[PDB]
Amino acid sequence: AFKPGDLVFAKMKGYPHWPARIDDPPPNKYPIFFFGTHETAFLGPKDLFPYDKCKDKYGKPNKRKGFNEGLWEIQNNPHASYS
Amino acid sequence: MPHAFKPGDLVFAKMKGYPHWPARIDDIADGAVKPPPNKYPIFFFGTHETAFLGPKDLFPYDKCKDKYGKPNKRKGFNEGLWEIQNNPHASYS
Amino acid sequence: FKPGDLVFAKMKGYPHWPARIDPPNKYPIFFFGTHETAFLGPKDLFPYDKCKDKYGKPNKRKGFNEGLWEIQNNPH
C-alpha cells in the first residue's frame, strides 16, 4: 500500500499529474499534499503514480501556477513542513 | 503615485476591434495557466472571457470611467458595466 | 483525433481557434492564421464539422479570420 511520506504524482481532473506526497480520509483514499500549491485532497490509488517510477514522464516543467515550485519541493525537500 | 498592476485592480482593457472594455486584473488560481512574461490575466466583465494583455492596453477604471463607462451595443458590454460598478470582485465562474 | 483532423482548439486567454492535429496525453496542434503550434489535451479540442456552427465565426484577434479562411478553403 501507500504510506505517509510516499512520493507520487497525483492526478485530478483538469490538471497535469502533480508532484505530491501521502500525508499522515474516506475508505481506500489517502490524504494527499500537493507540492507547490500546498493544497490538499483525498484521492484513491487509481490517481496515484509512484514518483521515482513516473518522474521521467510526469516531472517536466509546465505553465501551471505552483507546478514548477512543486517540482523543486518534491526533489529537494519533500518531507518538510509547508504549513 | 501609481503602483504596478495587481490582482483586483479595475481597468478598461483595450482589444483590437473592440471598445475599451470593463475588466479586472485577475488572480491566478493554484494550478491554473499562468500568463506570458510581462502580460496580465485580464478578466473581461459581461463576456466573462480572459485574455493576456500588457499595460499599454490597460486603462485604470477610476481615471477613465467618465470616458469609457457608457453603454455600448456590443454583446456583454452593458452587463460588464453593471459588474465593474456593482460587484467587480465576485466569482463569475 | 488523428494527424490532419480539423478542430477548434482552446487555450487559456484565447477564443476557440481553428486548428488541425499535427507530453502525456497532449496532441500537437497547428493553429491556422497565426501558424503557431502548441500541445493541448483532448478536453481543449473540438471537431471542426461538429462545432463550426458555434465557433466558426469572425473574431478580431490577430490572425483569427485568416485562420477561418484556411480551415475552410486550404486546411492541408
Author numbering:
A (entry chain B): 4 to 27, 35 to 93
B (entry chain A): 1 to 93
C (entry chain C): 5 to 26, 36 to 89
Question: What did the article's authors report about this structure?
Answer:
The PWWP domain comprises 100–130 amine acids and is often present in chromatin-associated proteins. Our structures revealed that the overall fold of the PWWP domain consists of three motifs: a canonical β-barrel core, an insertion motif between the second and third β-strands and a C-terminal α-helix bundle. The canonical β-barrel core harbors an aromatic cage constructed by three aromatic residues, which is a signature feature of the Tudor domain “Royal family”. Taken together, similar to other members in the ‘Royal family’, PWWP domain also exhibits methyllysine histone binding ability.
HDGF (hepatoma-derived growth factor) and the HRPs (HDGF-related proteins) consist of a highly conserved PWWP domain in their N-terminus and a variable region in the C-terminus. HDGF2 binds H3K36me3, H3K79me3 and H4K20me3 weakly. To shed light on the molecular mechanism of methylated histone binding by PWWP domains, we determined the crystal structures of the PWWP domain of human BRPF1 in complex with H3K36me3 and that of human HDGF2 in complex with H3K79me3 and H4K20me3. We were also able to co-crystallize HDGF2 with both H3K79me3 and H4K20me3 peptides, which show very similar binding mode. In all these complex structures, the methyllysine binding aromatic residues are from the loop between the first and second β-strands, the N-terminus of the second β-strand and the C-terminus of the third β-strand. The histone residues C-terminal to the modified lysine do not make significant contributions to the binding, reminiscent of HP1 and Polycomb chromodomains, which mainly binds H3K9me3 and H3K27me3 peptides through residues N-terminal to the respective target lysines. In these complex structures, the insertion motif is directly involved in histone binding, forming one side of the histone binding groove.
